[PDB]
């Protein structure tokens, strides 16, 4: 799960991490009041959407007086913000962050993230703040420090000195940044994060370091023990159908294609999408449903799959191991009751009582249910119906 810039920064403040003063605004009047309350003579007015690239998209404007705050907030709040990261449809802006303007002299890249191959944490830093870190790594590797942090020891001064070298920081500047990085590492660990990205991290003319932006991603498996992170969720930023499926115990991902699939187990579900492609059609979705799911759950899975009116065939591919295929077949028949659908359903059930299951489906005399037992035959039947 991802959170907004303003939410990351409130976490930072709650953990003693230096941050520019700022506050979220849900209306134009709230934006103006926030600027008044913050003081100074410069305020950034920022669209709050999860997607990056808000500046180029026109979602960040720097106001020099309270009329500009009012004007900018009116233009940004309610806009459809298009960035490179939103894609062309853009995203409706429903909240602003109002932040005091800093006197920026340097911008850096800083991220903390999981290194899967080494089973440890990486701290990535670059002198090239604001830029695309993948392009900087490819083109100019000497402007990047990639520092491997063994979690047994955690982040140490010696790791920091490597970051400070690549950022060209002097002794005292280095010490101040390294102190901030130690707090960010501790937060990353404490909140079960899997990505903390600050692009850019600014150094002010007064010698302070702040995150000008912040993108935090949290391990979905650990949200149960961080209720203060879970409550930050913004469902307008998440896919409604994926979320709805997950409420019913289903994992669903929408693709563009003509053959829907319903499968038990993520590996077999991916393999099912793969065989549809190999057969010369296109998978319309990933869906993992338990073979033991209730007919109610199966009925919800049918509902979700059939929303896509480009689908020409449903391929049910279920391996009943511990769960008997004959009971899966009965549940599919129950789940199709009172449904009005003109597309064929290929049902490949294999494993325990596979033969009985096929007998049950054949005996229903519902001729647009087409039972198969072997995977190869299943996929060939799907292909003939497309």
């Amino acid at each position: 799960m991802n959170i907004h810039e303003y939410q990351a920064k409130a976490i930072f403040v709650d953990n003693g991490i230096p941050t520019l003063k700022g506050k979220v605004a849900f209306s134009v009047d709230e934006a103006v009041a926030n600027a008044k309350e913050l003081g100074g003579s410069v305020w950034a007015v920022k669209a709050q959407i999860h997607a990056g690239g808000r500046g180029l998209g026109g979602g960040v404007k720097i106001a020099k007086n309270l009329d500009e705050v009012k004007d900018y907030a009116s233009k940004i709040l309610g806009m459809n913000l298009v960035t490179h990261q939103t894609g062309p449809e853009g995203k409706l802006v429903q909240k602003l962050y109002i932040e005091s303007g800093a006197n920026i002299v340097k911008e850096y890249y800083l991220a903390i993230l999981f290194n899967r191959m080494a089973e440890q944490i990486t701290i990535i830093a670059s002198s090239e703040g604001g830029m695309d870190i993948e392009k900087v790594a490819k083109e100019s590797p000497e402007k990047i420090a990639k520092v491997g942090i063994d979690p047994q020891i955690g982040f140490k001064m010696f790791h920091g000195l490597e970051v400070a070298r690549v950022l060209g920081l002097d002794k005292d500047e280095g010490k101040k940044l390294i102190s901030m990085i130690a707090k960010l590492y501790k937060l990353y660990m404490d909140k079960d994060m899997n990505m903390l990205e600050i692009n850019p991290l600014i150094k002010t003319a007064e010698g302070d370091f702040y995150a000008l932006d912040a993108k935090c991603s949290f391990d979905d498996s650990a949200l149960y023990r961080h209720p203060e992170i879970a409550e930050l969720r913004d469902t307008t930023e998440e896919n409604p159908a994926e979320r709805e499926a997950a409420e019913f115990g289903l994992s669903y991902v929408k693709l563009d294609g003509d053959v829907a699939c319903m499968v038990n187990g993520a590996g077999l579900a991916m393999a099912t999408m793969d065989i549809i492609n190999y057969s010369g059609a296109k998978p319309a979705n990933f869906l993992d449903v338990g073979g033991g799911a209730s007919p109610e759950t199966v009925a919800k899975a049918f509902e979700i799959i059939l929303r896509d009116k480009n689908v020409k065939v449903i391929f049910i591919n279920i391996f009943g191991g511990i769960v008997r295929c004959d009971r899966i077949a009965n549940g599919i028949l129950e789940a199709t009751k009172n449904v009005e659908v003109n597309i064929p359903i290929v049902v490949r059930l294999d494993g325990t009582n596979a033969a009985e299951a096929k007998t049950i489906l054949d005996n229903s005399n519902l001729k647009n249910i087409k039972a198969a037992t072997n995977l190869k035959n299943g996929a060939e039947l799907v292909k003939s119906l497309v």
Partner: protein, 289 residues
Amino acid sequence: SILVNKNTKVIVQGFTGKEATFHAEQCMAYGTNIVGGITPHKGGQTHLGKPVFDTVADAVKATKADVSLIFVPAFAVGDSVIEAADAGIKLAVVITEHTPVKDMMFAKQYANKKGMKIIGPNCPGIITSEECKLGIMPGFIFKKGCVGLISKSGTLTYEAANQVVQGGYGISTAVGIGGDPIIGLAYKELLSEFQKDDETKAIVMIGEIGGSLEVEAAKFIKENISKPVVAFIAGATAPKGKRMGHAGAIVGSADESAAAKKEALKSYGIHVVDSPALIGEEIQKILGE
């Protein structure tokens, strides 16, 4: 066979839970030597005719088991792996899905230091055909034969096993290595075991998108494994940057993609299968009719 057999003594962590009870009973009926289990505050009881203990340490002292089968909920997995390692368990098979990655990261470092190997988490376990099973796999699919199986998935493993049995062969041992970003034993360690196992003549490896274990395995196979290897890598059609059910099944960069893995395996001489329907057929090509 590798790692486990009909004599291996096994304790169950989370023994009295409902699911664990169901599977433990099926494992015992299949031939697994389950000698006991753990549930805090139920020490001294009896369950499925075996002793219950409060702690792994009490169970290991009474039974001398050095293999554990772990069914505890996701919030308990890390601490249960650490407990097993602390007590002298040598192999922990961890079924449960949705373990926080960080918990697994720390638990594995401790297991490594104590010399405990892990299978899983987020896996169906390990089975030695017609001898023993530790986990949730359907025993009867696994008919004894000369084909080893290593898989990051559950049901797709059964599909592969079934194709091999239908194609006139069978399985020596099948290991589900897990669908999480951090797992225990994987392709290199298990391929080495299978290479030393005289009953195994060929190995099927089943992978998926995410990380690069299957790329690294390719060179390793060329250099160390002379038994034939068949590979199927799920997720050729997966979109980039999207989790496909399993926490580990996400393409973050090009070398984590199914195409990158298949291409590496192919170039090092592995028998790579494009269609998941044709794994059994590949084994028939290799071994004969």
